C-alpha cells in the first residue's frame, strides 16, 4: 500500500543511516573534496604504501594483524578485517528490516551467511570511481592501477570489484534507493537450505514494491531503473562466486593465510 510503502522506505533509509557509519554521501563528498574534514591520503605504489601504513602518526590503530609479511598479502588481511567489520554493520541494519527476526532462526543465518558479501560489494561502489577506493573510513584512496599491478592472484581480487563498480554507480542510486536494495538482497529466497521459503518471499515481496515506489519517485527520468537495478543482482551473484574461486587458488599458492572465525563460518560450505 502506498503510504505503507513509503512509511517502509522510510524506515530502512532510517536503520541504514543508523548502521554505516560511512555511507554514500559521505563518500563522494570525500571523494569529491566537498568536505573539509580531511583530504584522503592516496595509495598507488610501493613507497606511497609504506607512507601510508606507517602514516599512523596522527591517526592510529583499529584491530587488524598490522603486519608481518609481504605487501599482496597484508592488503588482502586488511580487505579480511574490513569486511568483518563490515559483516557486523550488515547483521545490524538486517535486524531493523520487518519480518527478520520473526523469521525461523536457522533461517536468519542462512540469509545473513549467502546476503552478507553480495551487500558488501554493492556498498564498495559507494567508495569507489574508475581510478580507485575509498579506505579506512575516507581517510586512504587505493589506485585501481596499484590495486592490478599485485602479484598475481590478488591483482584478481580487486578488478572485478571496480568493473561492476564503475556500471553500479551510473545508475547513481542514494542511500535512500540503497537502504530498500540491500534489504531485498538479504531477503532471498532461493538462498540454499532454506527451511521456510515462503515468508521470506513474502517479506522480498513488499520490499520489491517499495524498491519501484522509491526509484519511481526518486527518479522520475529513468527509463526502467527498477529492471536495471535487479540485473545487477545477477553481476553481484557473479562477483561473489568469482570470488570464492580466488579463495581457493589462495589455498594452494599461499601459506598460513587464516580467516577470521566469522569469515570462515561464512565461506563454510558457501555456494
Ligand atoms: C572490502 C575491502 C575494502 C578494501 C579494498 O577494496 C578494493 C577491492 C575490493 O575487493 C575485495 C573485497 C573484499 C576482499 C577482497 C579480498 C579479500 N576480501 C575479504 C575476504 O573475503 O577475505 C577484495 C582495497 C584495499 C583495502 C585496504 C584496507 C586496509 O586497511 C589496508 C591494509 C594494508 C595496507 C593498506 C591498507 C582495507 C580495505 C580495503
Do not use: W
Not at 573534496?33 to 613507497?47: E, L, W
Request: net charge negative; glycine share 4%.
Amino acid at each position: 500500500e502506498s503510504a505503507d510503502l513509503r512509511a517502509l522506505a522510510k524506515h530502512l533509509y532510517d536503520s541504514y543511516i543508523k548502521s554505516f557509519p560511512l555511507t554514500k554521501a559521505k563518500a563522494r563528498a570525500i571523494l569529491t573534496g566537498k568536505t573539509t574534514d580531511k583530504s584522503p591520503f592516496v595509495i598507488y605504489d610501493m613507497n606511497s604504501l609504506m607512507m601510508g601504513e606507517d602514516k599512523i602518526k596522527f591517526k592510529h590503530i583499529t584491530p587488524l594483524q598490522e603486519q608481518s609479511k609481504e605487501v599482496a598479502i597484508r592488503i588482502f588481511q586488511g580487505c579480511q578485517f574490513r569486511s568483518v567489520e563490515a559483516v557486523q554493520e550488515i547483521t545490524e541494519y538486517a535486524k531493523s528490516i520487518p519480518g527478520f527476526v520473526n523469521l525461523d532462526l536457522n533461517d536468519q543465518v542462512t540469509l545473513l551467511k549467502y546476503g552478507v558479501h553480495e551487500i558488501i560489494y554493492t556498498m564498495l561502489a559507494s567508495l569507489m570511481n574508475k581510478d580507485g577506493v575509498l579506505i579506512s573510513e575516507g581517510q586512504g584512496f587505493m589506485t585501481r592501477e596499484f590495486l592490478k599491478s599485485l602479484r598475481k592472484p590478488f591483482g584478481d581480487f580487486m578488478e572485478p570489484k571496480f568493473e561492476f563498480a564503475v556500471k553500479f554507480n551510473a545508475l547513481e542510486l542514494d542511500d535512500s534507493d540503497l537502504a530498500i536494495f540491500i534489504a531485498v538482497i538479504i531477503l532471498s529466497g532461493d538462498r540454499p537450505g532454506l527451511l521456510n521459503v515462503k515468508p521470506i518471499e513474502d517479506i522480498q515481496d513488499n520490499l520489491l514494491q517499495a524498491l519501484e515506489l522509491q526509484l519511481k519517485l526518486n527518479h522520475p527520468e529513468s527509463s526502467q531503473l527498477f529492471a536495471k537495478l535487479l540485473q545487477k543482482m545477477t553481476d553481484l551473484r557473479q562477483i561473489v562466486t568469482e570470488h570464492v574461486q580466488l579463495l581457493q587458488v589462495i589455498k594452494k599458492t599461499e601459506t598460513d593465510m587464516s580467516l577470521h572465525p566469522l569469515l570462515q563460518e561464512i565461506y563454510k560450505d558457501l555456494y
